Structure formats: C-alpha cells, structure tokens
Structure 1
Amino acid sequence: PQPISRLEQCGINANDVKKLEEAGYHTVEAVAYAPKKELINIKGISEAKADKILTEAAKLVPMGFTTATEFHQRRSEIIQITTGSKELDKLLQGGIETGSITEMFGEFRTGKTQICHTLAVTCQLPIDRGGGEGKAMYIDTEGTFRPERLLAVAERYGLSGSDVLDNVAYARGFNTDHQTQLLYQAEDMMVESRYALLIVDSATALYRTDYSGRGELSARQMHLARFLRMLLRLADEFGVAVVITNQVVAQVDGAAMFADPKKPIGGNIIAHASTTRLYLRKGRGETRICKIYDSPCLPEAEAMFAINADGVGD
C-alpha cells in the first residue's frame, strides 16, 4: 500500500529507484522485505545506494519486536473470504483467510477449480455478507478458466453481471518462467487498485512437465521455492489471500498404509511454505469431502460440500 514515491527522498533521487522499478520492486514494503544481496545484483546500485535504500525503507515499515496483544488485535480484523458452502465455512472457521497461502490439492473431478471459481465471485462481496470487497486474480496455468461459471455463482449471490466478469484479472501462464514473471506484473496492478484474492490454479502444473528426469529436481525445487516466496511477499505486502491449487502423485511402493496414495506433488518445499492445506476428495454423486490436511490453528477435521449449478455449495 506504499508505492515507491515515498522512498525517492532523503538523500535519494528518483533515477536510482527507477532501476528498482524494472528490477521488480514497486513498493516500499518490497525492498525492505528484500535482502542486501538481491538488491545489490541490480545494475546501478552502489553498496551505499544499497544500505541507504534499506535504512530508509526500514523507516516506513514496522521492523521490530511487537507484543502478542498488539498482534492479536491485528488478526481480529483480518478478512476471511467465504466459500459458497456453509459446512465448508464452519470447518475453516470463516473462509479462506487473507495474507496466507492456502493450498488446495486433490486428484481430479474433485473441485479444485470450482472453488477457485466461487472464490473469485465471493471475494467481490461486501465484508458484511462474504469476502472482502475487491477484484481478484486468476493466473490460470491449465487452460480451464470458464467465465460462464462466474455468471452462475453471480446469479445466486445477487451480484449482477459483467461487473463481476470485469473485476477479475486473468492471465495464462505458458511456461514455468512466465508464471513467475506474471507476478512482477501482478504487484504492479495490486498497487493501483484494491485486490482481495490471488488464485494461482495448478501452481505446480508447469513443473511436472518442464523439469523432468531427477537431474532437474534440485533445479525445480529451487524455482518452486522462489515462486512460493515471491507469492508470500504478495500476501504480506497488500494482504491478499493466495489460494494456490495443486495436484497429486501416487507413491508406488510398500503400502505401509494398509489406502490409495495421493501425496500431493511438490516436496517439502510447497509443504513447509503453505499456511493451510485442504485435501479435496470425491464422494457420492456431486458431494465432495474437504479435509483440513495442515493448519497452524485449525483442527484436523472433515467437512462436506457439493458442486451445484452455482459453484460449490451445500
């Protein structure tokens, strides 16, 4: 919420920060969250330019030791976008939370993109009846973004039309390097607007196909880590929920389970860098089962939703 126009001051001109702009940084909270090395590789930045930039960015960002009675009253006003369902909102104690990565893995025909389609329409509702009012972002990397399914949920939620269809930025990631450069552009839109969501559908779809052979595994999880850290600097900067959708693999070995293995794709890189992880599952007919699979404050309980003609629901 602070563009770099309040940092082009105090012994710093705007020409040097003009380099920061094309370096990726568009916020005062984006250079302060960045280390010395990352901003020292930029052509132009002298070590002094670097230490001055950091010390003057520290001025406008709280970087210190707060108490836990001041962090409790900052998360008592956190916005929680509601999913379409009520049995899925009770399980999550309020819908997807803002300022945290929320993975949704599952296998197929489970509802990983129908939740991401009823979330891009509820995150446009007043906070008093749903999500936090603001636009959304759909970074679709599978080809499945149906705008005809947004007008179905925005016929039950009372939202009208092309208004819903308009406050949804949509981008299509074609490879694994254009996925990560589609965020240096998203951080340019989120500061000249008010977004309240960032859906990255199948965030790990273009990793299964780009890096393959076990000789490209340390080079894949060193890119996934960068991705999920760049996606964690968008959730702390502007406070936007970051639902990321994942996939599953099948460990073909000793059962040691007695049973069908799912074990979502992405190792201990997308597992240790994710706040909540919902495990969607197939059920009888149109009913699905969503089990919380990891969360710092939520019980490991189960729920029940259904993919209606209006997105997920009851």
Structure 2
Amino acid sequence: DLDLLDLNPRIIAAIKKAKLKSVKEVLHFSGPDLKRLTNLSSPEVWHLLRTASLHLRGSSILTALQLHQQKERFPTQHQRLSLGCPVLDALLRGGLPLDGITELAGRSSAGKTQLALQLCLAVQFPRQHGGLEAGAVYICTEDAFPHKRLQQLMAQQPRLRTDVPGELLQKLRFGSQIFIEHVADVDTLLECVNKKVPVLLSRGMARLVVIDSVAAPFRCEFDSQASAPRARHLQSLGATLRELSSAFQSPVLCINQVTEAMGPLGFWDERVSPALGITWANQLLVRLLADRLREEEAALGCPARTLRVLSAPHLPPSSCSYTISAEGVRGTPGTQS
C-alpha cells in the first residue's frame, strides 16, 4: 500500500530496500529508527512522515455542532440500548452506550446474571423499542449456563414488555439468536475473545458481548507477587474489547466480583470494592454497582436491592431500587436519588 503515495523514486527505492510494507509499518517506527533504516536525511524523512500521516486520514473537518445535529450519521452519540425497564432506563438516561466497556459489580446474589439475561433478551427488539435488531454472545467462566431460567424468561417475555405489541413478539426467535461459549482458563478466554467473537460480530449475528465474570480466572491464577503479568493480560484484554466495540458499534458488558475494603479510589465508607485493582478500572467507561442489604430485608421481609452509578463521563452519581420476580428484573417507581 506504500505505492499509492507520491514520492520521489529514490525515496521509494530506499524504503523498499528497508523491507517496509505498509503505512502502519512506517508510522510504527520513530525518526531515528527510519534514519538508521533508510539511510536518508531529516527533510525527506519528515516529508515521508507528512505523506504517510496524510494518507491515513485528512482533509475532513469535524465539529461538535455536526455531532450534536447529524444524529443518523453518528449513532454512537445518540442511540442507547434499553434495559427492558423504564425506571432503569431513566436512571441510565436511555440505556447502555454503544461504544465502551460497561462494568457491573456487586456481592453474591445481587442479581447481575438476571440483568445479563434480560439484556440478552432485550437486544433483539426493533429500533423503536430500545433494541438493536440483533442477537447476543454470552461467555461463561465460573458456572454452567442457566438454561432453565432463560427458558422461563423467554416464556414470560410477553408479560414483561407490555409496550411492544404481541404480534411482533410472536415472530421473535429468542433462543436462536443467543450464542453460548464456555471458558476454563485465562489463555482460553484470550483466545476466544481474539478469534471467535470477531467472526460472530463481523457477520452481523450479534451486537452485544457479555464476558460475565471476568475476575474468575484472574483470582485463581495470579497471586500478589505476579502483578505485572496480570496487568499485561488485563491491558491486552481491555484493548481488544474496546477495539471490537468501537469497530462494530456494539456494547460490551462485563460482570465483576467484589472484595472487602478492609481511600485513594474514593471508597472510604463502603464495605466492598470492585476487584482486579486500578489497572482494570482504567479501561472502563461506565461503572455500576448492584447491592443487596440483608440487614434491612430482615425487617422488611422482602429483599432490598439497589443499583448505583459509580462513575460516568455524562451521568451524575445516583441510585434506584429494583426487584426480581418471575418476569425478570424490574425497577421500583419513584425511588431514584
């Protein structure tokens, strides 16, 4: 692809003698590296950088006004994936973003898997009903996939989504558009993400990725004396997930575990904090926290569950309350803080 440019024949001959293949190859190196390779001088090396940089992109001017006004041209800035409940959508101001990793962390029995299943079901609805008209990919890491609960949810779906007409519901093939994968190791998870997910995403069979418990293998394979390889693996995984989500305009939902706090990270008066440290926290866009209070349900009788927004570039820190029943996860009206 280096011959599409306009260079002097001597420069092209020199760069061909240096076994340089593409524009990414030449932009990968530095000025002194190209000086040592091509045996050129600074002005023509600078001109080569000029030409390559202009080749990658240029001549296009984008302003915030265009992003704000041209909604159809930029679906990332204006389109959100619904959660299946009006109250949760109101808490999230529309739903999940279409570009970036969204975390969901909490203690056991908080209700993360139920939310994952509900999102996997709701991603298949038409555009006007909050969906993306596509399937989903589910990756299991700790336990086996709960198929019985999925069958119950698919059966009960017409009774949860009241707004959608029944005729459109009848033609929806819920079970045929969900793909299930199983992973037993860190290397297996990395290989799966690198190979199987892009194939499914490119063909258009799915527009949502659920890594589920991402902390499960890292908690068991890396100790406190091997933080550097763990950080390297986490950075690679996060970079790959972000690249895939940006390329295919599909949300990525990750489920995380918590550890006892036992506050540089802003977790002073909290009992538990998300695991995997700050290296994993640096890769996220929206951070949520689902919690259950067992000391208050002992008085109420019914479980007390809250969903909280820890951090977001466009959402204030707030919370609401929800319940879990046979239909699925549903929010409680008039509880947002």
Q: TM-score, normalised by structure 2?
A: 0.71
Check whether the contact 1:79–1:132 (CA below 8 A) recurs between aligned residues: no
Measure, in 2, the Cα distance between the counterparts of 1:211 and 1:57.
44
- Could you tell me which amino acid in structure 2 is paired with residue 92 of structure 1? L
Tell me the residue number matched to 1:187.
198
- Could you tell me which amino acid in structure 2 is paired with residue 150 of structure 1? L
Check whether the contact 1:80–1:132 (CA below 8 A) recurs between aligned residues: no
Question: Residues 175 and 157 (structure 1 numbering): CA distance in 2 closer, same or farther, change over 3 Å?
Answer: same
Question: Residues 170 and 263 (structure 1 numbering): CA distance in 2 closer, same or farther, change over 3 Å?
Answer: same
Measure, in 2, the Cα distance between the counterparts of 1:240 and 1:167.
15
Question: Residues 216 and 79 (structure 1 numbering): CA distance in 2 closer, same or farther, change over 3 Å?
Answer: same
Q: Which moved more, 1:222-231 or 1:75-84?
A: 75-84
Check whether the contact 1:136–1:169 (CA below 8 A) recurs between aligned residues: yes
| Matching of residue 222 in structure 1 with residue 239 in structure 2 | no
Q: What SS does the aligned partner of 2:306 have?
A: strand
Tell me the residue number matched to 2:91.
91
Tell me the residue number matched to 1:295.
312
Give the C-alpha shift of residue 239 in structure 1.
Answer: 0.6
Alignment of 1:1-314 (within 5 A): 36=28, 66-72=62-68, 73=70, 74-75=74-75, 78-158=78-158, 159=169, 163-184=173-194, 185-212=196-223, 214-252=224-262, 259-283=269-293, 284=297, 285-314=302-331
Q: What SS does the aligned partner of 2:277 have?
A: coil
- Structure 1, residues 188-211: CA drift from partner, whole Å, max 9, x if none? 121112422111101121101011
Measure, in 2, the Cα distance between the counterparts of 1:175 and 1:234.
21
Question: Residues 63 and 124 (structure 1 numbering): CA distance in 2 closer, same or farther, change over 3 Å?
Answer: farther
- Structure 1, residues 164-203: CA drift from partner, whole Å, max 9, x if none? 1111111111101111111122111211124221111011
Measure, in 2, the Cα distance between the counterparts of 1:224 and 1:164.
33
Give the C-alpha shift of residue 57 in structure 1.
Answer: 12
Task: Give the number of aligned pairs.
Answer: 271
Tell me the residue number matched to 2:20.
none
Measure, in 2, the Cα distance between the counterparts of 1:98 and 1:127.
13
Question: Residues 76 and 267 (structure 1 numbering): CA distance in 2 closer, same or farther, change over 3 Å?
Answer: closer
Measure, in 1, the Cα distance between the counterparts of 2:208 and 2:54.
26
Give the C-alpha shift of residue 229 in structure 1.
Answer: 0.9
Check whether the contact 1:83–1:312 (CA below 8 A) recurs between aligned residues: no
Question: Residues 75 and 124 (structure 1 numbering): CA distance in 2 closer, same or farther, change over 3 Å?
Answer: closer
Please report the RMSD computed on the Cα atoms of aligned residues, expressed in angstroms. 3.4
Question: Residues 86 and 58 (structure 1 numbering): CA distance in 2 closer, same or farther, change over 3 Å?
Answer: farther
Question: Residues 157 and 68 (structure 1 numbering): CA distance in 2 closer, same or farther, change over 3 Å?
Answer: same
Check whether the contact 2:76–2:97 (CA below 8 A) recurs between aligned residues: no
- Structure 1, residues 137-188: CA drift from partner, whole Å, max 9, x if none? 1111112421222233333433459921111111111101111111122111
Check whether the contact 2:76–2:249 (CA below 8 A) recurs between aligned residues: no
Measure, in 1, the Cα distance between the counterparts of 2:205 and 2:55.
24
Measure, in 2, the Cα distance between the counterparts of 1:265 and 1:257.
12
Q: What SS does the aligned partner of 2:227 have?
A: coil
Give the C-alpha shift of residue 129 in structure 1.
Answer: 1.3
Check whether the contact 2:287–2:311 (CA below 8 A) recurs between aligned residues: yes
Rg larger in structure: 2
Check whether the contact 1:79–1:127 (CA below 8 A) recurs between aligned residues: no
Q: Which moved more, 1:92-101 or 1:140-149?
A: 140-149
- Could you tell me which amino acid in structure 2 is paired with residue 198 of structure 1? V
